[PDB]
Amino acid sequence: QYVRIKNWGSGEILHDTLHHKATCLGSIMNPKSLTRGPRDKPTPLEELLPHAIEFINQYYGSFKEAKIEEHLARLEAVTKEIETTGTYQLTLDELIFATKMAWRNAPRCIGRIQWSNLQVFDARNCSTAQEMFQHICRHILYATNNGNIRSAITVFPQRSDGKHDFRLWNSQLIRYAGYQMPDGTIRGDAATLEFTQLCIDLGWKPRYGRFDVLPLVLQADGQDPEVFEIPPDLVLEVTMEHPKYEWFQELGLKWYALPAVANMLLEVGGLEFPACPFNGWYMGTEIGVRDFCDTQRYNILEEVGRRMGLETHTLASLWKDRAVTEINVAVLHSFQKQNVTIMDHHTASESFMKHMQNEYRARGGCPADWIFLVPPVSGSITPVFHQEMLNYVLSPFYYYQIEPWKTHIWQN
Amino acid sequence: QYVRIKNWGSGEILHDTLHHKATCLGSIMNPKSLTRGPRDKPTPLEELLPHAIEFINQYYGSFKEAKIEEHLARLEAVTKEIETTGTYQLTLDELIFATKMAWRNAPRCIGRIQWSNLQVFDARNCSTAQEMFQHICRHILYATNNGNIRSAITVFPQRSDGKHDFRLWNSQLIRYAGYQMPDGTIRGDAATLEFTQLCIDLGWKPRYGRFDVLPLVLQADGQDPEVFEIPPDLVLEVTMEHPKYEWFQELGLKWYALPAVANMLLEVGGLEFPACPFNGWYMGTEIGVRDFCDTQRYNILEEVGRRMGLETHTLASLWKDRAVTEINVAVLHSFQKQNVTIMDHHTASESFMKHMQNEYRARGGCPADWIFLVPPVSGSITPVFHQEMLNYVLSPFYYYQIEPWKTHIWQN
Ligand code: HEM
Ligand code: HEM
Ligand SMILES: CCCCCCCCO[C@@H]1O[C@H](CO)[C@@H](O)[C@H](O)[C@H]1O
Ligand SMILES: CCCCCCCCO[C@@H]1O[C@H](CO)[C@@H](O)[C@H](O)[C@H]1O
Ligand SMILES: C[C@H](O)[C@H](O)[C@H]1CNc2nc(N)[nH]c(=O)c2N1
Ligand SMILES: C[C@H](O)[C@H](O)[C@H]1CNc2nc(N)[nH]c(=O)c2N1
């Protein structure tokens, strides 16, 4: 009938019935069930048609007051389109609905309470890399909005036969470079070494800085990828300052204000969109905890420890807990001072609890990946830690993709 | 062939081959796959015999130098025993091996590096509740060891037909009571209200204190449960003090030094042990984060906030992070000062990483439940957060059980 969900915090019980519409490996980052690979032939008509019917029904069933004539007309028009062309085109309104629903169906997203507030940029008419670059620049500019961040998504042309895919080779729109120095040390974001090297190989000019924004590596209509530098006037950054420790700014840190996922695939009604970058606004712990404190990233934890005068040689002193918290305070304080939208993890978790609650009333479910929803620091202090969650893959949905460099056939 | 495991911290790769010997719901606390319920008929001989053979082979295969004659003799002797009695008895040495292996196969345990260091108390000859009480007292006394905590387990008689089960009704050996006061407020451990009431119903005398140790509710040979008070001289406690904030002790807090799970079932070679309490030593965050900071427990977070002079009215101030850390420092400092064994979560996580590493070399696997292994605070700061893990149920194994009060048929 349904699955029982319990909130060990408030003792509340939820009944999950939404999992029935889904299509021990838990701590796997990129599992196959969350990936949607490439193809070299169109989507079989016997598979496409049913999925399209399902979607058209979902879309029309969401209206406050049903419009049956249009519903039938659309189902019929879509079928005829599939019969005559082997694929079909979504109406702008259907695309909008799809992007929000896909967001809404993202197990790993904690900001889903904002699901209905999303700007959609229709770039399905695109043809060249230069044109992709232009759309991406518009997106970056729109979303940044002088610090008052706005969530948006740019939808490029859908996969046709699978040989003319549009793909952003970057993981995010804005991301810093990582360089292996001559003296053996690493500079910048150590996690981007191979990709930085890739850009260098394609002609990009390395500036060997600590915070050099990487170029957009665009691939359009199956063509080989072209490199484009992001116009510095478009990249808004925040200078890190601590509200008490003046020595903090001496660390010379900063971070970009725009969190935008660039390499995911949007699946809707049998249609696949290999290129559709999107963004929301940052949750403080992503920068404060992941970017700055991961040993495989900027790794600033120990230096902030010494600066604070902590006993960085005794783990039981809980110095790491003391440091990470100050770094997080610096991040939040800095964004707040530069008037750049940002949300702390505590407020974020509460917001999601409200969302999950709204979702179960509205449709009897909310796909949730606990491992991703629980913040990287102070987990049990947040309500999300005490919430039992079901993790299933609905549709529409945003899937991961096999890295483009691993399956791309180079022409020149 | 095997499953690939990746450590996103060091980039290392492990090959899991151990999962083949196993018998999306992830964030479920007490799933059926981890529970072993009651029965009213013996274990079918066609099921028992194979499991027994498997175990005897495992046990004999673990010796540095195989002793084949004994191996054959044992297999044969065990079969004859099963044929003639319908069950069988493990040798003390086999029991020891079973308890350690079960520990070793506990997905949710972070202290598994200590797996081979375990004291085993053989109480399989027990008959009455008074006798269980005596064994439990010996265990508590042995394990506490004046603060220098020792890991131990007391094994009571195995399930025969399922109608003469030995069961400790408590979740832990030492645990504080929770009382609903006349003025509506809760006193003590709010999580133990029903159980405290149960004890009261069975004759126990409520002292309405904040830290009253609950009585042992023992059930022996299927008989109705008898209540027994734990001798105060046996319960070692630690008074909470902060190394800087003198107002900390004014909070009048303390906690027991002995973490002992009392209600789990030990499964080995087809045999089931419904009563086998065990203990290790505390990991600081269990008390500092779970006991003191859970809203459904002692809920001291806000008071510690005000005392610190923090802005407890603004979540973005990260006051909760500041508080919880001081509480954790108080806990660790207090145990260290009273000479009571304890391990901080940072050291704990490192220790487990070493264990997991040792396990993959030794047997190509280590069952791990990420959701439980990652500490309640500062997750990504610990190496465990960046480790991909496989969660499977091997054998021997410690299972959960349906609450005794839910399936017990009362006699008087
Ligand atoms: C408005 C503010 C938003 C906030 C604060 C938020 C926050 C987050 C966070 C904290 C993550 C985890 C990132 C990581 O650790 O890798 C995430 C993941 C994700 N978000 Fe959101 N989000 C927001 C908006 C959006 C929007 C607008 C979309 C898409 C239309 C979305 C789609 C996703 C998806 C698909 C993931 C999974 C990405 C992955 O698995 O790597 N989110 N989000
Ligand atoms: C020597 C020190 C040890 C440490 C520091 C340690 C620590 C822990 C911790 C932190 C948990 C999670 C508790 C919770 O949040 O519910 C746990 C669970 C567990 N431990 Fe260990 N442990 C130790 C020894 C042992 C021993 C001696 C055994 C058994 C022979 C064992 C068996 C288990 C089992 C079965 C669980 C799962 C309990 C549950 O799911 O509620 N551990 N341990
Ligand atoms: C073979 C394909 C058959 C498709 C049958 C579609 C029937 C119409 O479907 C209906 O649409 C309404 C909105 O217009 C919704 O409110 C109803 O819940 C839904 O059942
Ligand atoms: C029907 C039951 C058949 C059981 C066959 C058991 C064969 C013995 O089993 C052997 O025992 C040795 C230790 O003595 C181990 O070292 C070997 O790996 C193991 O194969
Ligand atoms: C191995 C594990 O899946 C990995 O470390 C995870 C854990 N939880 C996460 N949670 C979020 N939000 N983001 C992440 O990248 C990760 N990574
Ligand atoms: C719902 C979720 O399973 C529950 O809150 C968990 C999370 N992780 C945990 N981890 C540990 N170690 N102990 C716990 O009790 C829990 N409880």
UniProtKB/Swiss-Prot annotation, chains A, B:
Polyubiquitinated; mediated by SPSB1, SPSB2 and SPSB4, leading to proteasomal degradation. It is found in: Cytoplasm, Cytosol. Heme b binds at residues 109, 400. (6R)-L-erythro-5,6,7,8-tetrahydrobiopterin binds at residues 27, 290, 371-372, 385. L-arginine binds at residues 172, 281-282, 286. It comes from the Eukaryota. Induction: By treatment with endotoxins or cytokines. Induced by lipopolysaccharides (LPS) in macrophages (in vitro). Expression in the liver oscillates in a circadian manner with peak levels occurring during the late night. Macrophages. Zn(2+) binds at residue 24. Homodimer. Interacts with NHERF1. Interacts with GAPDH. Interacts with S100A8 and S100A9 to form the iNOS-S100A8/9 transnitrosylase complex. Interacts with SPSB1, SPSB2 and SPSB4. Interacts with ELOC and CUL5 in the presence of SPSB1 or SPSB2 or SPSB4. Forms a complex with ASL, ASS1 and HSP90AA1; the complex regulates cell-autonomous L-arginine synthesis and citrulline recycling while channeling extracellular L-arginine to nitric oxide synthesis pathway. Produces nitric oxide (NO) which is a messenger molecule with diverse functions throughout the body. In macrophages, NO mediates tumoricidal and bactericidal actions. Also has nitrosylase activity and mediates cysteine S-nitrosylation of cytoplasmic target proteins such PTGS2/COX2. As component of the iNOS-S100A8/9 transnitrosylase complex involved in the selective inflammatory stimulus-dependent S-nitrosylation of GAPDH implicated in regulation of the GAIT complex activity and probably multiple targets including ANXA5, EZR, MSN and VIM. Belongs to the NOS family. This is Nitric oxide synthase, inducible. The gene is Nos2. The chain holds residues 77 to 497 of 1144 of the full protein.
